Amino acid sequence: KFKAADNFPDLSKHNNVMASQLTKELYEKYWDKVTPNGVTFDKCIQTGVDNPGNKFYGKKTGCVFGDEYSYECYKEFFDKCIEEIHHFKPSDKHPAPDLDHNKLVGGVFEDKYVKSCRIRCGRSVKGVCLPPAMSRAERRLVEKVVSDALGGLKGDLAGKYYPLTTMNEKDQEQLIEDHFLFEKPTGALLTTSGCARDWPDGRGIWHNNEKNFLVWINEEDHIRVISMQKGGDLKAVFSRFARGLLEVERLMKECGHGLMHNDRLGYICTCPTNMGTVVRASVHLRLAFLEKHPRFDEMLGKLRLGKRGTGGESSLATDSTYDISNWARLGKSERELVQVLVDGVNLLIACDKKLEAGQSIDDMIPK
Amino acid sequence: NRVGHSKPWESGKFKAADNFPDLSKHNNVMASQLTKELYEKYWDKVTPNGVTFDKCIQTGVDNPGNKFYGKKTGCVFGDEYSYECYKEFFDKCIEEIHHFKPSDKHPAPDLDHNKLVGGVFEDKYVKSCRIRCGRSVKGVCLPPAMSRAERRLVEKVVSDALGGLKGDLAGKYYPLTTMNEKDQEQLIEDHFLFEKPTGALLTTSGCARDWPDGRGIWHNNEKNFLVWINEEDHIRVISMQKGGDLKAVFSRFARGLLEVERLMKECGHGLMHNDRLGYICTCPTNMGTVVRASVHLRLAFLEKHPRFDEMLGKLRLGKRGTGGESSLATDSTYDISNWARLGKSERELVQVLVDGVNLLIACDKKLEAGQSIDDMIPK
């Protein structure tokens, strides 16, 4: 018999959320505590141990859920991480879902300002393990459950399923051309946490025939779904997004399957960052004039909105064009969070115009 | 619950076939040898340490390769129990890898360097030699599965035993996990250092976990007997020097390995060993003696002979080179080593090198004098 002290990791030179929130006392409490599906605390934290990362750029999360029982099994540790990631207290209750896109208020912007928009999310199937711990048979089941429910979509949501594992050269060139393909993870999170095992077994790409509704099966998560188009019609984007999701879930239930949802935390995925609504509403927004105002970042943060360049995590401004999105994932509903983007974009554009006319925006800015 | 993953055989929803991997396009030993029958049989079976069959084969599943890269092994031993547990599978791999059948038996160890005959060569011919093996610590999981604690234990056992080494076999331990820049600089120049694995096997098998914890470097004062702790295996011992005194290299190698074992016994600790297959390491290529004896040998005339490879292969040896590294092109000089690992003992395998190297050098002189060598070539 070893003790937890004997197995406790030296995280002194680490830089991730798990390392900041892990204590020895917590380790001892959860060390030998195992989930229903055989998932361990060491398995939840192993990718953070294997990835000290850097003080220099991007503190990662350093931990993952193995299944739906992982959170409440290791509750004390996870509430700590969630607060750091989210500003969400242990006593905070994430509201019920809300995919009522008719109740969204004017998400139709000028193409002149909004060049393209999108909304994506993550989801998991309840009763299955998450990509870190799940088995081949589990992954195969998820693919059936999901690919089959996507086949039940008609109208503008009608599409087809492209399995990675039988992909041909003909379909593959297409999907690359469309930018819909995904490959085997090479990143450190995904490899070290177990989310690249058994490739390409269980993974596939599904899109609607309109090519404005894309789903990825068994990549980082069971389900990744994106609604997208050029121009400023976020409203059509949320319509499509909401409608597919609600319907997918429904056909899933007909067949005896449901989405992974926690009462306090909402929807569950492999990363603690992907929680609550798990919604990223964003636009590519052209802000020539606002760009150059000093209180631009101040307003943003007050609007609860994030900015980056139009190339992902680490891209700067180019042609005065920004990727604007809701910052929050928990505490608010799906459509509530899309509305933040709507209300925040509206202000942003009106302030840009104000400056183009050479006028003040002091009492346009929030607080 | 070693392997923090879900065990599909536990619900009773899933059969073995539901979990059988598709290895149709794979190019590894494991894929060539796994059957759906064998999966069904071993799917359920779990070692006393909690090591699973899928745990053993996962790396092969995750690394299919092409016809263009080499055929890899594709599996791993989680612990001492792993071979036995999945024996019908493993014997197939062992026979592909080693041409060693389920009825063959690896002989008892022989590290009596005083029974080696004639391993001293002209420095003109042999520019350097070395001998390396891998060893594991009995009663402990192997690098793919072992815990942080297990690896900490091993570090201390092996470091304590290298501790009590005296004579020309004495030196100091440099653990990685409190390495200073001073020692690190030296060791790089010395070519003694090692880093976290980046390659496909070590990563996918769990051999890069928790780095640098439990990992270190030991060497002797003479800088010619070097031990890596808990890199790919618990233990990796290398004996090496410039020039051609292979005999000295084996003596040093043999005596230390025998004394290291002895000192571990002293503290109730043993080397992981199977009566049929010898010493166990993480990779199934690394069995029997797990000894690689090699020389860097100059063959300025023998390169050119058409029957050079026919001889080498009949001598049970293989060629290669460390000349890629050097900013200048090395000569006609090859890393020559014993091909085999299993059916013969360590000192026996060293002798196969000595003997083949004796022939090789004689054939090069022979050619230099304009004489024929056909009659010299074995079979």
Side-chain angles (χ1 to χ4, degrees), chain A residues 15 52-60 308 312-316:
Chain A
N15 184 231
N54 284 282
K55 296 187 160 206
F56 296 94
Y57 200 57
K59 176 182 207 177
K60 313 291 175 148
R308 354 180 274 194
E313 254 94 67
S314 178
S315 51
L316 193 70

Short mmCIF file of all heavy atoms in Angstrom, two decimals, chain A residues 15 52-60 308 312-316:
data_model
loop_
_atom_site.label_atom_id
_atom_site.label_comp_id
_atom_site.label_asym_id
_atom_site.label_seq_id
_atom_site.Cartn_x
_atom_site.Cartn_y
_atom_site.Cartn_z
N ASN A 15 1.80 25.89 -14.91
CA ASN A 15 0.90 27.06 -15.12
C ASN A 15 -0.40 26.67 -15.83
O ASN A 15 -0.59 26.91 -17.04
CB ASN A 15 1.61 28.20 -15.86
CG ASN A 15 0.74 29.44 -15.99
OD1 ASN A 15 0.58 29.98 -17.08
ND2 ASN A 15 0.17 29.89 -14.88
N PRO A 52 2.79 21.46 -18.06
CA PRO A 52 3.01 22.62 -17.20
C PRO A 52 2.74 23.93 -17.91
O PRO A 52 2.32 24.92 -17.28
CB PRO A 52 4.50 22.51 -16.79
CG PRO A 52 5.09 21.51 -17.68
CD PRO A 52 4.01 20.65 -18.22
N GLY A 53 2.97 23.94 -19.21
CA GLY A 53 2.69 25.10 -20.03
C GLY A 53 3.59 26.23 -19.60
O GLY A 53 4.70 25.99 -19.09
N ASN A 54 3.11 27.45 -19.76
CA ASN A 54 3.98 28.61 -19.57
C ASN A 54 3.33 29.78 -18.83
O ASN A 54 2.15 30.12 -19.07
CB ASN A 54 4.50 29.10 -20.93
CG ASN A 54 5.60 28.22 -21.47
OD1 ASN A 54 6.76 28.32 -21.03
ND2 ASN A 54 5.25 27.36 -22.42
N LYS A 55 4.12 30.39 -17.94
CA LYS A 55 3.87 31.76 -17.47
C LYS A 55 3.76 32.74 -18.66
O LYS A 55 3.04 33.74 -18.60
CB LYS A 55 5.04 32.24 -16.58
CG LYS A 55 5.31 31.49 -15.25
CD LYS A 55 6.42 32.27 -14.46
CE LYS A 55 6.47 31.97 -12.96
NZ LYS A 55 7.07 33.11 -12.21
N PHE A 56 4.52 32.43 -19.72
CA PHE A 56 4.67 33.27 -20.91
C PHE A 56 3.39 33.48 -21.73
O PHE A 56 2.98 34.62 -21.98
CB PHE A 56 5.77 32.67 -21.81
CG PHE A 56 7.15 32.66 -21.18
CD1 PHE A 56 7.61 31.54 -20.49
CD2 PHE A 56 7.98 33.78 -21.28
CE1 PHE A 56 8.88 31.53 -19.90
CE2 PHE A 56 9.25 33.78 -20.70
CZ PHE A 56 9.71 32.66 -20.01
N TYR A 57 2.75 32.40 -22.17
CA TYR A 57 1.49 32.58 -22.90
C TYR A 57 0.40 31.50 -22.73
O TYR A 57 0.61 30.30 -23.00
CB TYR A 57 1.75 32.89 -24.40
CG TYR A 57 0.55 33.54 -25.05
CD1 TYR A 57 0.02 34.74 -24.53
CD2 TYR A 57 -0.09 32.96 -26.14
CE1 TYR A 57 -1.10 35.34 -25.09
CE2 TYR A 57 -1.22 33.56 -26.72
CZ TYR A 57 -1.73 34.75 -26.19
OH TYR A 57 -2.85 35.33 -26.76
N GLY A 58 -0.78 31.96 -22.28
CA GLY A 58 -1.98 31.13 -22.19
C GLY A 58 -1.93 30.08 -21.09
O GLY A 58 -1.52 28.95 -21.33
N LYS A 59 -2.35 30.47 -19.88
CA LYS A 59 -2.65 29.50 -18.82
C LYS A 59 -3.80 28.58 -19.23
O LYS A 59 -4.92 29.05 -19.44
CB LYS A 59 -3.06 30.23 -17.53
CG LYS A 59 -3.49 29.30 -16.38
CD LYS A 59 -3.92 30.08 -15.14
CE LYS A 59 -3.72 29.28 -13.87
NZ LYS A 59 -4.06 30.03 -12.65
N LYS A 60 -3.54 27.27 -19.34
CA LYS A 60 -4.61 26.33 -19.67
C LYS A 60 -5.31 25.85 -18.41
O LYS A 60 -4.98 26.26 -17.30
CB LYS A 60 -4.10 25.13 -20.48
CG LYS A 60 -3.19 25.46 -21.68
CD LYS A 60 -3.90 26.16 -22.83
CE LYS A 60 -2.88 26.56 -23.89
NZ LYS A 60 -3.46 26.53 -25.24
N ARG A 308 -10.87 39.28 -30.51
CA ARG A 308 -9.63 38.77 -31.06
C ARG A 308 -9.62 39.16 -32.53
O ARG A 308 -10.58 39.75 -33.03
CB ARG A 308 -9.53 37.23 -30.98
CG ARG A 308 -10.63 36.54 -30.21
CD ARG A 308 -10.42 35.02 -30.19
NE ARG A 308 -10.97 34.34 -31.36
CZ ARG A 308 -11.14 33.01 -31.45
NH1 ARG A 308 -10.81 32.20 -30.44
NH2 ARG A 308 -11.66 32.49 -32.56
N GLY A 312 -8.58 33.08 -34.93
CA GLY A 312 -8.52 32.22 -33.74
C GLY A 312 -7.83 32.80 -32.50
O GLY A 312 -7.35 33.95 -32.52
N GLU A 313 -7.77 31.98 -31.44
CA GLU A 313 -7.14 32.30 -30.14
C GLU A 313 -6.11 33.41 -30.20
O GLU A 313 -6.31 34.46 -29.58
CB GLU A 313 -6.49 31.04 -29.49
CG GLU A 313 -7.23 30.41 -28.28
CD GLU A 313 -8.19 29.26 -28.66
OE1 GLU A 313 -7.69 28.19 -29.11
OE2 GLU A 313 -9.43 29.41 -28.49
N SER A 314 -5.02 33.19 -30.94
CA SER A 314 -3.89 34.14 -30.95
C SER A 314 -3.68 34.92 -32.27
O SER A 314 -2.61 34.83 -32.86
CB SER A 314 -2.59 33.41 -30.59
OG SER A 314 -1.46 34.28 -30.65
N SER A 315 -4.67 35.72 -32.70
CA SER A 315 -4.49 36.59 -33.88
C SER A 315 -4.84 38.04 -33.55
O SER A 315 -5.83 38.29 -32.86
CB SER A 315 -5.34 36.09 -35.06
OG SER A 315 -6.69 35.89 -34.68
N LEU A 316 -4.03 38.98 -34.03
CA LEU A 316 -4.27 40.41 -33.75
C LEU A 316 -5.24 40.95 -34.79
O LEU A 316 -5.64 40.23 -35.71
CB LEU A 316 -2.95 41.21 -33.78
CG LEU A 316 -2.91 42.66 -33.22
CD1 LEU A 316 -3.06 42.67 -31.68
CD2 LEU A 316 -1.64 43.44 -33.65
#
